[PDB]
């Protein structure tokens, strides 16, 4: 039997995501440092390791290179024999230890009367707008990149056409309301801070006093938390701790809720999101990667979506934890929370099959659709 | 992990740079939260500070804070400090010299952060501090109010703003919560505290260049008040017991006293570090 | 002690209207002294011999210096014709009468402190006011 | 009948990728280059344009500025789409071959790969509609409205090794890095050149390249006339990828010779430019009749004007077309400063208008008038400042401040568009922010359909001096910075000052004068008239401008007290803070001392 534990992650001071241009690994661009808002699902799964290696006093590569002859397969059996790769994408398990499954990260609000748990998900880029095609034959085609594919029509569902000037999709938050839908700004939801720090001592006696950074803090919004589904193998309890995420030294509380054993997280994340579901699209509600994008573009009328970028950290067990790490030499490029994937009149079954390929990130908590 | 609360009790004036985009009559501001626009020292200006104190014992300063920049190998910090949030503050009085300042609002949020953090002693200081917070509610009932403790301070006048501080017999002060708040303690409304913990009635003290007996430069500092007391949280990664022993007991000796923020050779910014008592 | 805008706008208008200033934007280049020596009066002698001595002008006391507390009455009205309730500070506000001199005012009901204060910030009043004015 | 309306690439996303300004460049006319060989085949043809209005002068190779925008409407003859699907191929594949040439630098990589990352990342999308209606103010919209739809798809490349140099996926990146080619050399006897790529000899032209531009110093310090590029090239071939090289050389050298280095020699200005009220010009265009060739031809020429004018001074434009303008200056050239190239371009976008839309303006009633401005953002920052950084700084400059985009984004994303509101967008401004190598940031924004913006520019042309002063003391600029301390400490005084209608200006003199004892030491003359007069303008402006908007914005429930305040702008505090960023700026231009 699995237990299946639901996650809440509360921010305790203020808190750092890392990007592409971080504080030092590129040319004199390393001094300004921005923030995501969300870690990547490989953050959740090395804090996830983390905390199984701390519970069980397993932790290792202290400020020293040591060998761990009988703890090697203790190691392997508790957390896996390394960390979240890209290169297993077709893999049918994680290939990690009692960590089952993972559902993306959710955005939650709490109210202060214990009474629910209100699920904020990245509003769909084609609400509010009608969006229709042609499926004949005739005239007002479009090519993307050689493609041909029907002219798509948007209209607000308020005959006028679609303003890019009016458009703001992309800065708002939804989450179900009585009948409608309640709309959050993203600005409401996460604070940004810029911390100007310098070195105090000079060195060497060359030209100095420039040692100035910046680092973008973000803050959660009060009553808000992160949240996310966790299946263990067997009997391996999580305990509740303060935790790092990412960043500079960012400290979360985890609180460690279980749910009940009949029950599936990916049905539960599904069930979550289920009032965004209209059957001409297909919602991206996790981050998506496809090895061909041309192949689902030809599986689809229209694409309304955005790109993010994608790095990991890949260490072993053996790995020198305390140095430069090392990071994916390939940084890959996902589909956007919000995306919408407008498909064929009869190919919704293809499109689907082509994200469920790829069980190992579906476990990850990446390519979920509703 | 044990999170713990320290206070701070600055013996002179603090400055601690904001860096910020500044543009009014005061040239150099000091750092101020975002959400509560009340004074505050930034974390890295606390481990910066306990770092360079600690510095000549280099093996717990690589245990416990990490591995100074520009070195070849990064070996991570133990010790998570926390931002240090204004407590109470000097205010000027006719009476006496001056009152420590506390809001009911810096009050409740420090309620809230010690149930938040769970600090060692939380459960005694919350329950005491939460019966104080309720009976100073009831005694005001949604006005105004300034409330002193000791029989002698009633009638003090506070100077900035008007205010005539008022002595409620039922309102017991517990000598813990004194020695965490400070003595000669004043609880007002956060409209008050506000007012003058704001840039127009914090210290501004003027400062030039001279030049062969004429003045070069000109400009303004903003300093917190000295004997101001400030609170933060110390979270250690289960770091080795001896040398955080050994780190906590040189922290909360008397003869120990940090430096935090600027002008340090003018003596700005020296204060002592006070552990939370049992209470 | 901080000066308002207001304060400094009612000194504007009460240095104009008791005529200190000409409709040439000149004021005489003795006032200024007038000013500080009335500050350093409050401060040796005290508040009410000091109003008493530049209030007076049946000898040739300058003929112009009772202008000084003219302005520092008006000023002190405009002050107490706003921030009038504001039950939860210490101050009582009135309007002194123009009949009344100020000397008068405080020897009957002066209370020596808040009128202290409202002195003291009218005379700073008036000096930044000044400020923006040339002498002759 | 038929029409074709094209659009390409994703242009901020390769703009964002660069680091430096030659890559920069690089990013920009990459585009420029590709609507250039994608329209060739259809402008030999005779094609009929609508929207851009391709002609001869445009294809005449300019400095490297690209004048090609990316979108194109064109009247389509039958076997048109399968031609430009064929083309745009073609045009790809010479591009990935031009990529992999070994004149490069790097290892040998293979077209097919960059064939395939060009197609997964450059934006080539094109729409054939069928409209009965010749009229181009008809047909222009029609299409660009399905464009703006279209462009909401997403393509990029799936995977992008970064990392090993050997493997390296990311080819635009390497395009940009490495357009200026390698470096070849005799036997000693010669001179150093850099080989440049396809889009420098494109650019510049296959022969009589002079010099191509590979660091930040040769536009900032292009004053003191010391041939940066080659003294440099020369000692980093004598050394022993050089980008870095060549930069940290340029620095050594100008260093070197110290007596002739103001510190804004280092200081790089980025100008960002967008036209207002084009589209209310086009729907008066629109209703008074007069065709839209008219408003291309005179934003043709104001663009080759404009291209002219940024090379007579110091300075390189990278994007000039229609509105929008891209350019890379030094503060100061020949003592002339930024702001005197801004009046230029801005006199030069006004004469145009005026030249080529004489029937436009005389038969329209003045009431109405739009008219086309040209709204400017300035961002002055240290030469190793991040380019990213610097060129979202000018973005934030032009949209949100000198567009008046806060307000309306502000008011739009809480549903307060409010016609009433809308009533109250401000145009033709100014946006200026001056970075110094400290984190001081000074930031100033001003109208330019007034008097005000012409005493700024007379006030500077005044007071910036145009030969650097050898003198070790600088009391004039001890008593500038005198003035500027006492300018930001008595602003509540100042405030008392404007506030006051009928006598203000009396006021502010004399306060001046009781404020400064002796205010004239040398240089600096009379300039408290100018700032109080400047002053005064600033004011009455910012009165006619942001009063009732205020007003309105504190008796709308549905805002909240942050965005309010971030909303409300105080005019008189405006006005002052206009005066200190001046002043502040020609204390940075005169003042010797960095930092
Ligand atoms: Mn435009």
Redesign the pocket.
């Known amino acids: 039997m699995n237990r299946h534990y639901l996650i809440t992650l509360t921010p305790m001071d203020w808190f750092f995501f890392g990007g592409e241009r971080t504080l030092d690994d590129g040319k004199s661009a390393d001094y300004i440092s921005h923030s995501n808002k969300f870690p990547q699902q490989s953050a959740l799964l090395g804090m996830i390791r983390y905390q199984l290696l701390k519970q069980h006093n397993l932790l290792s590569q202290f400020p020293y290179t040591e060998n761990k002859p009988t703890e090697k397969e203790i190691m392997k059996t508790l957390i896996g024999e390394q960390s979240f790769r890209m290169t297993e994408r077709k893999a049918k398990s994680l290939g990690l230890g009692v960590i089952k499954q993972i559902s993306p990260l959710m955005l939650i609000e709490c109210k202060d009367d214990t009474s629910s748990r209100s699920i904020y998900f990245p509003l769909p880029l084609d609400d509010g707008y009608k969006v229709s095609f042609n499926e004949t034959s005739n005239e007002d085609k479009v090519f993307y990149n050689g493609i041909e594919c029907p002219i798509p029509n948007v209209y607000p569902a308020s005959r006028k056409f679609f303003d890019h000037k009016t458009y703001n999709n992309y800065l708002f938050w939804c989450t179900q309301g009585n009948n409608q839908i309640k709309k959050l700004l993203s600005d409401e939801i996460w604070i940004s801070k810029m911390q100007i720090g310098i070195t105090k001592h000079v060195e060497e006696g060359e030209d100095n006093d420039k040692s100035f950074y910046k680092q973008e803090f973000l803050q959660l919004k009060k009553s808000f938390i992160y949240a996310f589904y966790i299946t263990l193998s067997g009997e391996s309890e999580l305990s509740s701790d303060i935790i790092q995420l990412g960043g500079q030294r960012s400290v979360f509380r985890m609180e460690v809720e279980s749910i009940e054993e009949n029950s599936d997280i990916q049905e539960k994340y599904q069930t979550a999101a289920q009032f965004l579901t209209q059957s001409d699209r297909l919602l991206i509600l996790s981050p998506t990667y496809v090895d061909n994008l041309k192949e689902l573009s030809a599986l689809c009328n229209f694409m309304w979506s955005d790109s993010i970028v994608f790095r990991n950290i890949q260490t072993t067990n053996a790995s020198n934890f305390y140095g430069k790490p090392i990071k994916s030499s390939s940084k890959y490029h996902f589909l956007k929370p919000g995306s919408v994937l407008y498909f064929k009149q009869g190919k919704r079954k293809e499109v689907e099959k082509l994200l469920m390929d790829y069980t190992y990130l579906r476990l990850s908590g990446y390519n979920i659709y509703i | 992990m044990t999170t713990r609360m320290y206070v701070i009790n600055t013996l002179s004036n603090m400055h601690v740079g904001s860096g910020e985009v500044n543009y009014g009559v005061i040239d150099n501001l000091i750092q101020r939260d975002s959400v509560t626009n009340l004074p505050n020292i930034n974390s890295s200006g606390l481990k910066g500070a306990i770092r360079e104190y600690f510095k000549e014992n280099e093996d717990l300063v690589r245990e416990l804070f990490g591995s100074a920049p520009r070195d070849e190998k990064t070996l991570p910090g133990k010790v998570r400090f926390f931002e240090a949030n204004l407590l109470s503050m000097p205010v000027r009085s006719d009476k006496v010299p001056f009152l420590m300042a506390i809001s009911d609002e810096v009050l409740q949020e420090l309620i809230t952060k010690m149930k938040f953090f769970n600090c060692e002693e939380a459960t005694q200081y919350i329950s005491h501090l939460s019966t104080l917070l309720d009976n100073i509610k009831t005694q005001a009932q949604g006005t105004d109010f300034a409330y002193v403790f000791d029989p002698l301070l009633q009638g003090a006048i506070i100077e900035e703003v008007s205010i005539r501080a008022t002595c409620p017999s039922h309102i017991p002060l517990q000598p813990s919560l004194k020695k965490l708040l400070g003595d000669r303690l004043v609880i007002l409304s956060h409209k008050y505290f506000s007012i003058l913990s704001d840039d127009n009635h914090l210290p501004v003290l003027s400062r030039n260049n001279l030049e062969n007996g004429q003045s070069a430069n000109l400009w303004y500092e903003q300093v917190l008040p000295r004997y101001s007391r400030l609170y933060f949280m110390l979270m250690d990664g289960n770091a080795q017991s001896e040398y955080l022993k050994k780190f906590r007991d040189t922290l909360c000796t008397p003869s120990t006293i940090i430096q935090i923020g600027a002008n340090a050779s003018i003596g700005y910014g020296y204060c002592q570090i006070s552990e939370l008592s049992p209470f | 002690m901080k000066i308002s805008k207001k304060q400094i706008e009612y000194a504007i208008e009460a240095l104009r209207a008791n005529n200190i200033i000409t409709n040439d934007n000149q004021y005489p280049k003795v006032f200024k002294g007038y000013i500080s020596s009335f500050g350093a009066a409050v401060i040796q002698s005290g508040l009410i011999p000091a109003i008493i001595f530049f209030e007076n002008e049946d000898n040739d006391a300058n003929a112009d210096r009772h202008k000084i507390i003219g302005v520092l009455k008006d000023i002190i009205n405009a002050m107490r014709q706003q921030y009038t309730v504001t039950d939860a500070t210490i101050l009582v506000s009135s309007q002194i009468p123009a009949n009344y001199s100020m000397a008068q005012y405080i020897i009957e009901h002066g209370n020596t402190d808040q009128l202290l204060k409202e002195i003291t910030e009218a005379a700073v009043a008036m000096k930044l006011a000044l400020r923006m004015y040339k002498s002759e | 009948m038929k029409y074709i309306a094209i659009t390409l690439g994703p242009i901020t996303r390769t703009i964002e990728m660069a680091e430096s300004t030659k890559e920069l460049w690089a990013a920009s006319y990459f585009f420029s280059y590709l609507a250039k060989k994608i329209v060739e085949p259809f402008v030999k043809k005779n094609r009929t344009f609508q929207l851009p209005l391709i002609n001869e002068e445009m294809q005449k190779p300019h400095c490297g500025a690209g004048l090609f925008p990316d979108r194109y409407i064109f009247k389509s003859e039958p076997g048109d789409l399968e031609l430009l699907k064929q083309h745009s191929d073609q045009v790809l594949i010479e591009i990935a071959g031009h990529i992999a040439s070994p004149s490069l630098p790097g290892t040998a990589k293979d077209v097919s790969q960059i064939y395939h990352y060009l197609k997964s990342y450059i934006k080539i999308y094109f729409i054939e509609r069928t409209l009965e209606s010749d009229d181009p103010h008809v047909v222009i919209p029609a299409c660009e409205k399905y464009l703006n739809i279209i462009e909401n798809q997403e393509t990029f490349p799936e995977q992008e090794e970064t990392m090993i140099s050997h493997q390296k996926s990311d080819f635009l990146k390497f395009l940009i890095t490495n357009v200026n080619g390698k470096i070849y050399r005799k036997d000693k006897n010669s001179i150093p050149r850099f080989t440049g790529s396809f889009l420098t000899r494109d650019a510049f032209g296959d022969m009589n390249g002079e010099r191509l531009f590979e660091s930040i110093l040769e536009i900032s310090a292009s004053e003191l006339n010391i041939n940066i590029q080659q003294k440099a090239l020369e000692v980093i071939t004598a050394n022993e990828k050089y980008s870095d090289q060549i930069w940290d050389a340029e620095e050594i050298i100008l260093n070197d010779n110290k007596a002739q280095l103001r510190p804004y020699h280092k200081y790089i200005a980025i100008i960002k430019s967008?036209?207002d009220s084009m589209g209310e010009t086009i729907k008066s265009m629109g209703a008074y009749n007069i065709p839209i060739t008219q408003l291309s031809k005179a934003l043709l020429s104001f663009n080759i004007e404009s291209i002219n004018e940024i090379v007579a001074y110091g300075g390189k434009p990278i994007f000039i077309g229609?509105?929008?303008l891209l350019c890379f200056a030094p503060v100061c050239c020949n003592g002339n400063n930024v702001f005197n190239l801004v009046e230029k371009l801005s006199t030069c976008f006004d004469q145009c208008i005026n030249q080529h839309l004489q029937q436009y303006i005389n038969a329209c009633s003045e009431a109405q008038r739009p008219l086309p401005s040209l709204s400017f953002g300035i961002s002055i920052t240290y030469h190793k400042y991040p380019m990213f950084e610097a060129l979202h700084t000018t973005d934030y400059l032009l949209e949100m401040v000198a567009k008046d985009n806060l307000f309306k984004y502000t008011l739009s994303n809480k549903n307060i568009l409010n016609e009433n509101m809308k009533r109250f967008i401000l145009k033709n401004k100014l946006a200026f922010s001056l970075q110094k190598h400290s984190g001081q940031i000074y930031h100033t924004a001003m109208s330019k359909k007034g008097k005000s913006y012409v005493k700024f520019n007379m006030l500077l042309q005044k007071y910036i001096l145009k030969n650097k002063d050898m003198s070790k003391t600088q009391e004039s600029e001890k008593f500038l910075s005198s003035v500027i301390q006492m300018i930001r400490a008595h602003a509540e005084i100042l405030q008392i000052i404007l506030q006051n209608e009928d006598k203000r200006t009396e006021m502010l003199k004399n306060y001046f004068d009781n404020n400064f004892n002796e205010s004239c030491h040398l240089g600096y003359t009379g300039l408290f008239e100018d700032i109080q007069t400047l002053l005064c303008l600033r004011y009455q402006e910012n009165i006619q401008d942001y009063q009732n908007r205020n007003e309105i914005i504190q008796q709308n429930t549905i805002l909240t007290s942050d965005e309010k305040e971030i909303l409300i702008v105080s005019p008189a505090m405006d006005a002052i803070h206009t005066i200190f960023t001046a002043l502040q700026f020609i204390h940075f231009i005169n003042y010797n001392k960095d930092e």
Do not use: A, H, L, T
């Open positions: 967008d036209g229609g509105d929008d």
